[PDB]
Amino acid sequence: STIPSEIINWTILNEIISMDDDDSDFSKGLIIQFIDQAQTTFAQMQRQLDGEKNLTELDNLGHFLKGSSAALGLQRIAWVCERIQNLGRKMQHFFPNKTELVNTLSDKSIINGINIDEDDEEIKIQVDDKDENSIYLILIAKALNQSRLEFKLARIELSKYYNTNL
Amino acid sequence: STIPSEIINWTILNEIISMDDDDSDFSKGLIIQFIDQAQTTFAQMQRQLDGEKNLTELDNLGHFLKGSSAALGLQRIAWVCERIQNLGRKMQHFFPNKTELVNTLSDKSIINGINIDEDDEEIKIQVDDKDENSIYLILIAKALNQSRLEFKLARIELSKYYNTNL
């Protein structure tokens, strides 16, 4: 609920876009690089959740994507990556439901015509009275599902701007 | 000149620094990461100028550093990188003297005390009559020396902000 309400911070992205005047494919190249890095990072995160379940690896991957997404003005993705980090460090103990987070959008009309659950992965972590990490891993799984939605929403908005499917 | 007159675009960098609230060393870490990459990129550019003199590789190195510097609000570095790129594609055919560029600075108290030629490398490219890449390599050499000054200026401003040696 301190999640930014807009998908794109235009005062950041417009500064990147300024540089397309002397390099026509510049901003679009950075976006295409980001979309590739985010898909690789989400797959790496999912594998941690499904395997070694290393909270420190999940913290590091979250850090990497927070930096990339913030720099391009994709502030809602950056915020969720920040949550994944602080859950991996055990500094936070809660993560909101999709409904709450989707309701914070400044233009709610963007989720009309899409299934906001389409990219969800099943949460496959069994609860444990003994493993002290199960609750954190559950919350990161939820946060990773949110990340995937926010990534989709960003791609829809960026696609409209560039007039092509990104 | 079209070179920005401030070393730091604070409206960009402040957005990045907004995220130190739940991750106290976030922005400082990105800047340390940039300073490391920048020093490596200047070295590789110098190796090209001194070695195989590949204009396309100089274009790629300029592209990379333009992306990293723009994203952190280091707008004078980004501008010079955009020149290097355009010189390497032979779309521009000139680059100004250090004097004209330094005089665009909105605060000239920062160069009080520094030798603006301190970090220059000698231009060791000969004006060959037959090679049409020759003038462009000289201009990129000249631009690399400006980049080195702009980099030092950025490190001074950022060090004063974070209150430590960066």
Q: Mapped to the 3 state alphabet, what secondary structure does chain A carry?
A: CCCCCCCCCHHHHHHHHHHHCCCCCHHHHHHHHHHHHHHHHHHHHHHHHHCCCCHHHHHHHHHHHHHHHHHCCCHHHHHHHHHHHHHHCCCCCCCCCHHHHHCCCCCHHHHCCCCCCCCCCCCCCCCCCCCCCHHHHHHHHHHHHHHHHHHHHHHHHHHHHHCCCC
What is the C-alpha to C-alpha distance for residues A152 and A165, in angstroms, rounded to an integer? 12
What is the C-alpha to C-alpha distance for residues A149 and B85, in angstroms, rounded to an integer? 36
What is the C-alpha to C-alpha distance for residues A96 and A2, in angstroms, rounded to an integer? 11
Locate A56 and state its tokens: 């420190």
Nearest chain A CA: its distance from B114 CA (Å): 30
| Residue that the structure tokens 């690789």 belong to | A40
CB atoms A23 and B82 under 8 Å: yes
What is the C-alpha to C-alpha distance for residues A41 and A38, in angstroms, rounded to an integer? 5
Method: X-ray
Q: How many domains does chain A have?
A: 1
Termini Cα distance of chain B: 29
Taking the Cβ of residue B66 and every Cβ of chain A, the question of whether any pair is shorter than 8 Å is answered with: yes
Nearest chain A CA: its distance from B46 CA (Å): 23
User: Do B142 and B120 form a contact (C-beta atoms < 8 A)?
Assistant: no
User: Do A45 and A108 form a contact (C-beta atoms < 8 A)?
Assistant: no
Q: Which residue does chain B place closest to A85, by CA atoms?
A: B23
CB atoms within 10 A of CB A31: 21
What residues of B are in contact with residue A63 (Cβ under 8 Å)? 23
User: Do B131 and B53 form a contact (C-beta atoms < 8 A)?
Assistant: no
Taking the Cβ of residue A11 and every Cβ of chain B, the question of whether any pair is shorter than 8 Å is answered with: yes
Residue span of the structural domain in which A152 resides: 1-166
CB atoms within 10 A of CB B115: 9
Taking the Cβ of residue B20 and every Cβ of chain A, the question of whether any pair is shorter than 8 Å is answered with: no
Taking the Cβ of residue B26 and every Cβ of chain A, the question of whether any pair is shorter than 8 Å is answered with: yes
What is the C-alpha to C-alpha distance for residues A49 and A58, in angstroms, rounded to an integer? 9
Locate B77 and state its tokens: 């570095």
Query: Which of A30, A73, A82 lies closest to B67 in CB terms?
Result: A30
Rg (CA), chain B: 16
Locate A111 and state its tokens: 């989720």
What residues of A are in contact with residue B11 (Cβ under 8 Å)? 11
User: Do B21 and A82 form a contact (C-beta atoms < 8 A)?
Assistant: no
CA distances from A10 to A80, A84, B18 (A): 19, 25, 16
- Best mutation site among B10, B15, B25 for testing chain A: the one with the most A CBs within 10 Å? B15
Residues with Cβ < 8 Å from B76, sequence gap 6 or more?
B3, B4, B6, B7, B150, B153, B154
* 8-state DSSP, B103: T
- Nearest 5°: CA angle at A80, between A123 and B64? 120
What is the C-alpha to C-alpha distance for residues B113 and B91, in angstroms, rounded to an integer? 36
Give pairs for B110-116: CB < 8 Å, separation 24+.
B110/B7, B110/B153, B110/B156, B110/B157, B111/B153, B114/B152, B116/B149
The 3-state DSSP class for residue B65 equals helix
CB atoms within 10 A of CB B4: 17
What is the C-alpha to C-alpha distance for residues B164 and B166, in angstroms, rounded to an integer? 6
CATH code: domain of residue B1: 1.20.120.160
* 8-state DSSP, B18: G
What is the C-alpha to C-alpha distance for residues A58 and A109, in angstroms, rounded to an integer? 32
Rg (CA), chain A: 16
User: Do A58 and A118 form a contact (C-beta atoms < 8 A)?
Assistant: no
What is the C-alpha to C-alpha distance for residues A126 and A117, in angstroms, rounded to an integer? 21
Query: Which of A15, A26, A85 lies closest to B12 in CB terms?
Result: A15
CB atoms within 10 A of CB B67: 20
Nearest chain A CA: its distance from B126 CA (Å): 29
Label residue A28 exposed, middle or buried (CB < 10 Å: 0-12, 13-18, 19+): middle
Residue type, B88: G
User: Do A146 and A105 form a contact (C-beta atoms < 8 A)?
Assistant: no
